[PDB]
Amino acid sequence: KAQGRTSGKVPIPGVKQALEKKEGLFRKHMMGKRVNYAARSVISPDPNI
Amino acid sequence: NKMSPYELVQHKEESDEIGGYFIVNGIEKLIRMLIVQRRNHPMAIIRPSFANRGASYSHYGIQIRSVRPDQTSQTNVLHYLNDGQVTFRFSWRKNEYLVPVVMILKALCHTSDREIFDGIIGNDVKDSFLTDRLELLLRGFKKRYPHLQNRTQVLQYLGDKFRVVFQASPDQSDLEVGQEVLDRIVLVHLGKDGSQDKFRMLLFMIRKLYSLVAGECSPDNPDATQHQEVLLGGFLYGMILKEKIDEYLQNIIAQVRMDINRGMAINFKDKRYMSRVLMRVNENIGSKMQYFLSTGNLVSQSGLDLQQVSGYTVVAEKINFYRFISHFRMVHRGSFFAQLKTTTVRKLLPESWGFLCPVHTPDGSPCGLLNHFAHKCRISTQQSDVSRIPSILYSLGVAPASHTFAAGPSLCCVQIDGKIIGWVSHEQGKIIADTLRYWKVEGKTPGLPIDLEIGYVPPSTRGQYPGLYLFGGHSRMLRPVRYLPLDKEDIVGPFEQVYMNIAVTPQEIQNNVHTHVEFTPTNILSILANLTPFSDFNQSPRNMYQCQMGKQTMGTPGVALCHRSDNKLYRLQTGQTPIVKANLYDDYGMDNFPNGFNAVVAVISYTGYDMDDAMIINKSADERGFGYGT
Amino acid sequence: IVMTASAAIKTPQMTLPIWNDVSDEQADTFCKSISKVLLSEVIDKVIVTETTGTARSYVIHMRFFDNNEYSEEYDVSKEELQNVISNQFIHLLEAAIVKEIKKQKRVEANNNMNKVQRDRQSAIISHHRFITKYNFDDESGKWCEFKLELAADTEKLLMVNIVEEICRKSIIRQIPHIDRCVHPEPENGKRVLVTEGVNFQAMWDQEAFIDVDGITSNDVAAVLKTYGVEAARNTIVNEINNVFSRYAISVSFRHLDLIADMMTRQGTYLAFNRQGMETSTSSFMKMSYE
Amino acid sequence: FSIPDGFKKCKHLKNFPLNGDNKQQQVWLIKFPSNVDISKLKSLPVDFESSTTMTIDKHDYKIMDDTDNMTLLVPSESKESLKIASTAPLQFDKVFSVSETAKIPAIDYSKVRVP
Amino acid sequence: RTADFRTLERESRFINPPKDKSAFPLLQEAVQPHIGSFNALTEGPDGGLLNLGVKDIGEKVIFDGKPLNSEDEISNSGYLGNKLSVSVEQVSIAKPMSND
Amino acid sequence: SEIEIESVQDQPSVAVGSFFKGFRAPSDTTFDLYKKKKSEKDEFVLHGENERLEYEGYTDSSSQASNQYVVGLFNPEKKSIQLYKAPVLVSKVVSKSSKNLRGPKIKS
Amino acid sequence: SVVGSLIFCLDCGDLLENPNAVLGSNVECSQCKAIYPKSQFSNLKVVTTTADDAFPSSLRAKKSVVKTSLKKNELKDGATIKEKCPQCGNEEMNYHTLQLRSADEGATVFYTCTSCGYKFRTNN
Amino acid sequence: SSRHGQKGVCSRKWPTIDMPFSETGIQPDIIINPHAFPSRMTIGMFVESLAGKAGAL
Amino acid sequence: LRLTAEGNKWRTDILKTSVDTGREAAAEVTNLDKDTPADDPELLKRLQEILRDNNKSGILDAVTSSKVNAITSQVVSKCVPDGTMKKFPCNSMQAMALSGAKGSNVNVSQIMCLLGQQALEGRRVPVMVSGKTLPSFKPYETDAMAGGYVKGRFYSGIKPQEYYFHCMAGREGLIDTAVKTSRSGYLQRCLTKQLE
Amino acid sequence: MIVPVRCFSCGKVVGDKWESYLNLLQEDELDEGTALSRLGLKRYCCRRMILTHVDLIEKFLRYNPLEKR
């Protein structure tokens, strides 16, 4: 909304831009989260399990 | 520079130290090569982005990329409007200036209206398509600009409107500024005081524009490896250095004017006022050149000819030696094209036979765009002597262009390096182009260099615009073949190659068709695509994926490693030479840098721990040091 | 289909089942009575002889094809060429000669006509701006002829490149919103005609040829507009299935019935987008989407 | 005027015997390289048509006829010594052209195509 | 076919690096578009591309805002002052040394 | 099918002009055939005038050192030509009444 | 000198104005002066035929020498490759492969019958 | 990886005790699955295999 | 991977019957007939017209790719199950493709018999302005091999001309993967939230 | 680098046959086939360890940072 300095790369995105993006708040920290008690690793084949 | 492999060892280098790169703050960087348009040759191109510019702009237009002798480029585009108006487009200081042609045609020399007529209508007087377009170009000037009766008055007008952005001083008159606009912008490969040659070429570019809108000519493909060259890494470094000293001479001038907008003290004959300015002028050019090699970002107040301002430089990598030597053969189409939605620039084409490798291109997103040069593909760095060629074409059947006035697709416009020199018939042009090649490879002619390419384009129905284009400049891709009479070596470029018959093996030479044969069929592959054993037995994506996987092996980067402090290196301990290997494995000296190790490999399903990718290493072989590295 | 729910499909079509008595020979005659014919498509050449003196004159001569070629390929009689060239074409050509004049201030020959051909010309001289002469081949339809005169005040004009653009704009006979009708190969015995463009109101008057109770488009916004919301629901499940069955992929109809019942839940054709989400209750589903 | 030095004016010329006849003197125009000297030759044996080949000093030529705008110029009388040769513009009559040729060798298809 | 591995030629080259032109000459030719192109900046005809380039961007001229107070004429108005024509007629790259 | 040559004059007998097509030059006025002198080299300069048409000419810097054009004089009952080394003069035609030029700047 | 609708000057080669578009019986050259007020020059006929790509049509395509259209069912594209049909009874079946992966997997074949036309795909 | 695009992960280090041996007494260093080859079509690996064996002999 | 000495002789005879096929489909599309010779100056006029038009060139490519693929499937129908050396209860390449273990019989036939037509953008090999498809070939060469037909196989190797055409079809399958890394990401996301 | 101590596949000690093999090829002027068979190498797993060895330690020892020049 604000023009201000109009030199480009506007700082302090403000409390709307903290909510609206692919990241925002509402898709990076509510609809998807990071979890405890989890692991990840490369998988390898086995016919004996 | 000129230093033995013994003395490269005594100065802490690898014995076959490769060179060809820069060291910038420890990081070991080089300049990517770019694929750009061929210099000094007009290209009849249709483009849908020409009607973007607004009203009555058609999809047609000639484009020439003219370079100066200091390898600095200036592109002129010659549009065709649907109203019969024909314009002229150029750039200056990131800004784009549209002008009529017959203000630029009439400022070059003293022109009548038959000289502009006969330049475009040599014969084809009775071609009613073409003489009607011409008086929307001769009446449309004389109606729109009715006060321009000679050359030294149209220079007044063209120097009046172009005074601010050309940044002239108030002592320069109107025609002195208007002569700069013709010296610095239109067709700059013909030099300054080359206006008699700049006039014949603009006539050639108007009729080629008119022969494209008549449908008589196929539109030249800018993405097809014959109408394009290679902007080298060192020539790009000198284009930006000329611009950096140009900002330097203007930052002196801007610093003097900040002293007369205050009025401190001025004597320009004084020794100590000169030193007083240059204390304050930033004269550290060499860190601005280091900033180019540090990030690749092209900063330019003018703006160069190129179409992007980022990613010109890359880091030379020593993850092995095959990754390192393949940076120096890598060429790139442009970063403008990886953003595109259409994947036709990525297509493998027959005009790259011998000049780009069909296999060696990276899998993924730069596929088709980041392809590598072939084996024996060389690039013209200096230009050869073209002073003696016009005196030889005159000894042959060429009629000189100063007193011929015979334009058209019905005749063969003989050019050298974009200078139109004369006119022949199409029957006589094929004989001139064949004797120039025979005189060339037999080195008894004093002035025909063997890297001169002889691009004869025979006439056809609605094909390419014909001609006898000869080239000798810089930045040209070249490769060797064998010329079948006299059996000598001939040097052939990609513009020649489209109309020449070049057999692959000597067992396929057929009577009265092939005039050339390849030396070896292996001269069309890369270096790394030619080390793959028995590659004519694999499927083609498996040869292409080897060129990706072969760069990423841990092998030997070098042997001077205790005198290096790179960020990370990968070194396999016990390499071996291969039993099964190509002959080029020895010529490129790959024994110095072993990539891998021989292994007893049993093609068997035995364990059950291996499907489609997975493999079984032997445990005791591993304990005995198999494939160990650090 | 699923996203954006467009009323402007790129290639809307219509599938027309033909009866039993109408053969493939009579269906090909029927496709030629629907597919549009431009006046461009019946011209062999246009010769424009420009002369000056007296008033700049402009003699436009049109070579058509043979009468037994364009009245076989296109089903356009030479009594239909007359009613397009005289009535429609010259008003379009004289609209563009004037419109250029605004920008401008900023073989064989035949004669000896009879009374029918004379007083037809007399109606055209009185009904156009700069015409003064006209003829037509009323024997064979191989040629037309009319001789415009403009003022001497006007300069050189590319008359051919105006005629090339107006001949490519003048329709001869177009049934509206339909460009072309084709006779494809009958799969599963279905003798159909496929029609590039949707107009159900036009194809209802062809009931001697077309089974009007079984015509089916792919434009769902048109089938919704004409045949209700339940027919639009059927058009969705057969146009998603045609996408998957073309790549030999099978999905169940239980999944395709559930999508067409979610799009047509308001009696309309709602997309899966931000705008079709507006008719929904939960605000956090809207906030968390976009 | 006032063109710089080097540019010397020529007060007298030689004579070109044309009268503007009517038999008539066929005026020609022929083209030669700097390899050949016309004074060191004496003959231009040319056929009725372009199917010609001369050999001077082991350099083979071919004398093309391209007869089917370059204006002739004759001495006025003696004073300024240039006027356009014309009866009322004017054209030449038979325009030949000599061009240097070279015998390209045929490919030796018994030695260059090895099985 | 017979394509030998050079096991007595390798060891005689690993121990003794050559004191003449390098073996493996095709490896020098693979960087000739880079090394040769940087060489054209300061070598070749017309003194290299850099000295040939500094005379295409030749002069940068300004004048004064101060007058001479000359004869009170149109020559007084036709006088801008005195004029720099600051130019660069030579650029030279020095091989890298060290200063202390 | 053979033709002998009587004379070849080094001295400038005849000239040749490359004017534009349809050039007339009414018969009242003559030309001036000059010559460039730098001790060995031969470059012709042309000039001529009347009340309107002032019109000079000059040779070419490429073709005259290489491609020589010769003017011949035949009659088929003679079986003979004589020749003259006749230069080809590239020429332009200016008018006196169109040599105006405006002020050197914007002047305002 | 008249070239079609263009008449050029006779001694300086400038372009004369359109003699019907000048004011009342007065033309002249403007480089030199070539006065012709009574407009000697006649009708200036330029006949211009359109180029035969200006009207693309299926009837012009039939006026070509080469074949510009394949027929309705007279190109069957090699209908005899042995493949065990899934549905009813066919031995022979057309195939078509296309590459999808990033040079780390091969390709996979499509299958369309010649007796029942059942579109089909096989993993291996 | 080999020089033919037959890359793959090391799925298991496998002891010589239960890895197949020959008439000559050679446990192979690397077992590759034969089910790699029908779709990859690296027959340059099938001729590198019998030409390296001839060259080592 | 090997055929027997009789089954190797079979495909040598059948591939010998493809030397006329490139002209027979050329002589058809031009609407000539009765086997005009290949260098006939009136055929070369007609082939040049086909090249300058994008529609007419696909008609030449669709007639010729339907005739050389007849010769392709005649070799495979004669040689793959029956003209081999080792057979199915010992042949692993056939057993891996019949069982559906890995690969198909298209892969077995390219190893053992021939690769076939290398089709590009649903057409044949692209061709220069000059009529040529490679600098090795004659301009407007009516041949199957000049249009990109491979009579070589992966068992005996492929020639340098047809090694170059097979690299063209290898790259158009990789630029499609370059434009296929996420096509349907926002379609599935927007379905899964209305129907959530 | 230096010749491996043991063969990778069989386990024969092979590290004592590199300076022997280079003198068999230099002074006896044998081919590589007989010189491997004289050294008691007769399994092709064990042949290639001496046959196909690069010995890059001779190129690494040229860079001694402890000795002057």
Swiss-Prot record, chain A:
It comes from the Eukaryota. Disulfide bonds: none annotated. It is found in: Nucleus, Nucleolus. Belongs to the RNA polymerase beta' chain family. Component of the RNA polymerase I (Pol I) complex consisting of 14 subunits: RPA135, RPA190, RPC40, RPA14, RPB5, RPO26, RPA43, RPB8, RPA12, RPB10, RPC19, RPC10, RPA49 and RPA34. The complex is composed of a horseshoe-shaped core containing ten subunits (RPA135, RPA190, RPB5, RPO26, RPB8, RPB10, RPC10, RPA12, RPC19 and RPC40) where RPA135 and RPA190 form the DNA-binding cleft. Outside of the core, RPA14 and RPA43 form the stalk that mediates interactions with transcription initiation factors and newly synthesized RNA. DNA-dependent RNA polymerases catalyze the transcription of DNA into RNA using the four ribonucleoside triphosphates as substrates. Component of RNA polymerase I (Pol I) which synthesizes ribosomal RNA precursors. Besides, RNA polymerase I has intrinsic RNA cleavage activity. RPA190 and RPA135 both contribute to the polymerase catalytic activity and together form the Pol I active center. In addition, subunit RPA12 contributes a catalytic zinc ribbon that is required for RNA cleavage by Pol I. Present with 2840 molecules/cell in log phase SD medium. This is DNA-directed RNA polymerase I subunit RPA190. The chain holds residues 442 to 490 of 1664 of the full protein.
UniProtKB/Swiss-Prot annotation, chain D:
It is found in: Nucleus, Nucleolus. The modification Phosphoserine is found at residue 34. Present with 3360 molecules/cell in log phase SD medium. Belongs to the eukaryotic RPA34 RNA polymerase subunit family. DNA-dependent RNA polymerases catalyze the transcription of DNA into RNA using the four ribonucleoside triphosphates as substrates. Component of RNA polymerase I (Pol I) which synthesizes ribosomal RNA precursors. Besides, RNA polymerase I has intrinsic RNA cleavage activity. The heterodimer formed by RPA34 and RPA49 stimulates transcript elongation by Pol I. Component of the RNA polymerase I (Pol I) complex consisting of 14 subunits: RPA135, RPA190, RPC40, RPA14, RPB5, RPO26, RPA43, RPB8, RPA12, RPB10, RPC19, RPC10, RPA49 and RPA34. The complex is composed of a horseshoe-shaped core containing ten subunits (RPA135, RPA190, RPB5, RPO26, RPB8, RPB10, RPC10, RPA12, RPC19 and RPC40) where RPA135 and RPA190 form the DNA-binding cleft. Outside of the core, RPA14 and RPA43 form the stalk that mediates interactions with transcription initiation factors and newly synthesized RNA. This is DNA-directed RNA polymerase I subunit RPA34. The chain holds residues 23 to 156 of 233 of the full protein.
Swiss-Prot record, chain G:
It holds the Pfam family Zn_ribbon_TFIIS. Residues 1-59 are annotated as: Interaction with RPA2. It comes from Saccharomyces cerevisiae (strain ATCC 204508 / S288c). GO terms for molecular function: DNA-directed RNA polymerase activity; nucleic acid binding; RNA polymerase II-specific DNA-binding transcription factor binding; zinc ion binding. Changing residue 29 to S: Limited growth defect. This is DNA-directed RNA polymerase I subunit RPA12. Component of the RNA polymerase I (Pol I) complex consisting of 14 subunits: RPA135, RPA190, RPC40, RPA14, RPB5, RPO26, RPA43, RPB8, RPA12, RPB10, RPC19, RPC10, RPA49 and RPA34. The complex is composed of a horseshoe-shaped core containing ten subunits (RPA135, RPA190, RPB5, RPO26, RPB8, RPB10, RPC10, RPA12, RPC19 and RPC40) where RPA135 and RPA190 form the DNA-binding cleft. Outside of the core, RPA14 and RPA43 form the stalk that mediates interactions with transcription initiation factors and newly synthesized RNA. Interacts with RPA2/RPA135. Residues 1-68 are annotated as: Necessary and sufficient for recruitment into Pol I. PROSITE patterns: RNA_POL_M_15KD, ZF_TFIIS_1, ZF_TFIIS_2. Residues 78-124 are annotated as: Required for RNA cleavage, but not essential for elongation activity. SUPFAM superfamilies: Zinc beta-ribbon. A zinc finger (TFIIS-type) spans 81-121. Its main location: nucleus. Keywords: DNA-directed RNA polymerase, Metal-binding, Nucleus, Ribosome biogenesis, Transcription, Zinc, Zinc-finger.
From Swiss-Prot, chain J:
It holds the Pfam family RNA_pol_N. It is found in: Nucleus, Nucleolus. Keywords: DNA-directed RNA polymerase, Isopeptide bond, Metal-binding, Nucleus, Ribosome biogenesis, Transcription, Ubl conjugation, Zinc. GO terms for biological process: nucleolar large rRNA transcription by RNA polymerase I; ribosome biogenesis; RNA-templated transcription; termination of RNA polymerase I transcription; termination of RNA polymerase III transcription; transcription by RNA polymerase I; transcription by RNA polymerase II; transcription by RNA polymerase III. Its main location: nucleus. GO terms for cellular component: nucleoplasm; nucleus; RNA polymerase I complex; RNA polymerase II, core complex; RNA polymerase III complex. InterPro entries: RNA_pol_su_RPB10, RNA_pol_suN_Zn-BS, RPABC5/Rpb10. Zn(2+) binds at residues 7, 10, 45-46. The keyword Transmembrane helix does not apply. Gene3D superfamilies: Homeodomain-like. PANTHER family: DNA-DIRECTED RNA POLYMERASES I, II, AND III SUBUNIT RPABC5, DNA-DIRECTED RNA POLYMERASES I, II, AND III SUBUNIT RPABC5 FAMILY MEMBER. Present with 5300 molecules/cell in log phase SD medium. This is DNA-directed RNA polymerases I, II, and III subunit RPABC5. It comes from Saccharomyces cerevisiae (strain ATCC 204508 / S288c). The gene is RPB10.
